[PDB]
Amino acid sequence: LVPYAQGKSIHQLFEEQAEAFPDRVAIVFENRRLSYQELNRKANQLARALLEKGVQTDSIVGVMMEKSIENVIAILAVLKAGGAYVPIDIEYPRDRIQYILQDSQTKIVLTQKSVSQLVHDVGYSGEVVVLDEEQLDARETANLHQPSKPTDLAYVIYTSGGKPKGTMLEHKGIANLQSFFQNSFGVTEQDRIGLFASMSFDVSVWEMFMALLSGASLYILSKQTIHDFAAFEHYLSENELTIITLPPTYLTHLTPERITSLRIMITAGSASSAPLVNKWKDKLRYINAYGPTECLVATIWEAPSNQLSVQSVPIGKPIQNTHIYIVNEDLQLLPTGSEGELCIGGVGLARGYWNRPDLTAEKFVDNPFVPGEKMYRTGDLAKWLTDGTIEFLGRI
Numbered sequence: 001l002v003p004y005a006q007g008k009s010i011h012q013l014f015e016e017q018a019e020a021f022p023d024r025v026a027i028v029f030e031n032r033r034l035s036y037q038e039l040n041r042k043a044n045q046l047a048r049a050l051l052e053k054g055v056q057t058d059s060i061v062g063v064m065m066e067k068s069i070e071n072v073i074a075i076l077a078v079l080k081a082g083g084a085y086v087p088i089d090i091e092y093p094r095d096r097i098q099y100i101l102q103d104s105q106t107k108i109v110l111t112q113k114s115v116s117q118l119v120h121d122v123g124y125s126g127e128v129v130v131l132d133e134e135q136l137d138a139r140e141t142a143n144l145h146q147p148s149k150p151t152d153l154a155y156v157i158y159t160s161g162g163k164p165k166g167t168m169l170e171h172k173g174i175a176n177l178q179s180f181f182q183n184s185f186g187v188t189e190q191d192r193i194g195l196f197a198s199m200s201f202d203v204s205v206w207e208m209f210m211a212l213l214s215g216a217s218l219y220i221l222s223k224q225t226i227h228d229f230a231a232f233e234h235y236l237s238e239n240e241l242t243i244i245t246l247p248p249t250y251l252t253h254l255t256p257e258r259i260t261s262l263r264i265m266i267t268a269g270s271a272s273s274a275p276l277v278n279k280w281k282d283k284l285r286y287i288n289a290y291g292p293t294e295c296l297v298a299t300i301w302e303a304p305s306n307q308l309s310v311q312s313v314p315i316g317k318p319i320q321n322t323h324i325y326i327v328n329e330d331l332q333l334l335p336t337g338s339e340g341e342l343c344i345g346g347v348g349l350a351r352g353y354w355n356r357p358d359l360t361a362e363k364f365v366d367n368p369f370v371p372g373e374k375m376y377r378t379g380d381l382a383k384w385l386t387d388g389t390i391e392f393l394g395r396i
């Protein structure tokens with residue numbers, strides 16, 4: 001076992017950073033910023049308000065907000081109250097929003113003034129908390145210390161293949177992720193980390209807690225900054241951001257020379273390409289990161305900074321405390337060179353799919369190699385290379 005904070009919750013790890021780095025910048029959005037102490041206090045105030053409204057272990061709390069500092073306060077508050085959040089994309093079709101609200105059965109939705117009309121337009125019948133109406137400045141600001149377990153729910157991400165399905169992720173996988181980031185990327189409180197992905201895409205979880213579980217600062221990129229490639233490059237350079245994660249298609253539009261500060265560039269979610277990697281791997285640390293939503297992230301490949309061109313782009317090796325099994329249709333293990341289904345075991349596996357027991361049992365099978373554990377069948381095709389890295393080959 002690679003060490004990590006085995007018994008600690010996500011918010012407990014955040015609180016350790018706020019205690020160690022109270023006056024460091026935690027989060028930036030446009031011309032606003034909050035220190036760790038300020039962010040923690042505001043999240044504690046909201047968390048107490050959420051407790052009074054029934055949030056408890058494995059409660060799912062909907063979030064319908066624009067990306068902003070208050071969006072992150074809402075997330076941390078839900079975790080501190082002992083619950084789990086479900087990010088609901090306010091740009092989805094109304095009927096998809098309604099499906100997620102109704103399927104999740106959430107009894108509380110956190111929103112903002114400019115979004116409250118949409119909440120009414122989807123006919124949501126639960127409790128609605130308009131955060132920029134609430135005056136919480138009077139509430140206690142200290143940490144709550146609610147009961148928590150690593151196996152408690154932390155977030156539910158809806159994805160679609162059929163109808164949307166809620167993928168249930170627990171605290172323990174994100175606690176492991178903290179140690180992965182500190183060990184493998186060397187993340188420290190000095191880093192400045194962009195937030196690029198939608199909060200409905202679990203890459204945003206990776207980005208947000210990359211910053212907030214290590215004392216680093218999280219720079220929430222505005223819509224206009226992302227839309228304009230030169231504005232994006234200027235924003236990263238002016239603010240001296242050190243780490244960013246991007247879709248490969250977005251990265252193809254960027255110029256290394258116009259980004260002066262990055263030490264790590266991660267691409268995730270889609271296949272990268274040898275020409276793309278060769279353009280960046282000798283200017284900074286280029287990382288290809290792979291995973292299904294059902295364990296957030298499973299493998300990483302750091303491209304070699306050796307002034308020699310690569311001809312292909314592996315998805316690399318399992319992250320700490322994650323196991324990869326490449327198997328045939330009978331779940332038998334394959335030798336190097338043989339293509340099979342990529343399956344995953346380890347601490348980051350989702351609990352399953354919300355109120356979908358048969359689908360959960362089909363996809364999160366008994367681990368044939370580790371009695372008493374589960375193994376997730378990704379549906380991705382892959383093979384081991386002779387050097388022990390993994391080549392991604394699409395879908396089985």
Ligand SMILES: Nc1ncnc2c1ncn2[C@@H]1O[C@H](COS(=O)(=O)NC(=O)C[C@H](N)c2ccccc2)[C@@H](O)[C@H]1O
Pocket residue numbers: 159202203206267268269270271272288289290291292293294296297298315378380392394
């Ligand atoms: N690096 C890849 N190369 C090539 N195909 C890929 C790759 N990363 C995913 N994929 C594909 O995308 C699927 C998962 O799609 S997803 O549920 O929308 N999640 C993501 O795309 C992001 C993923 N959860 C994640 C989050 C944070 C860090 C790393 C990865 C995988 O099963 C693969 O088919």
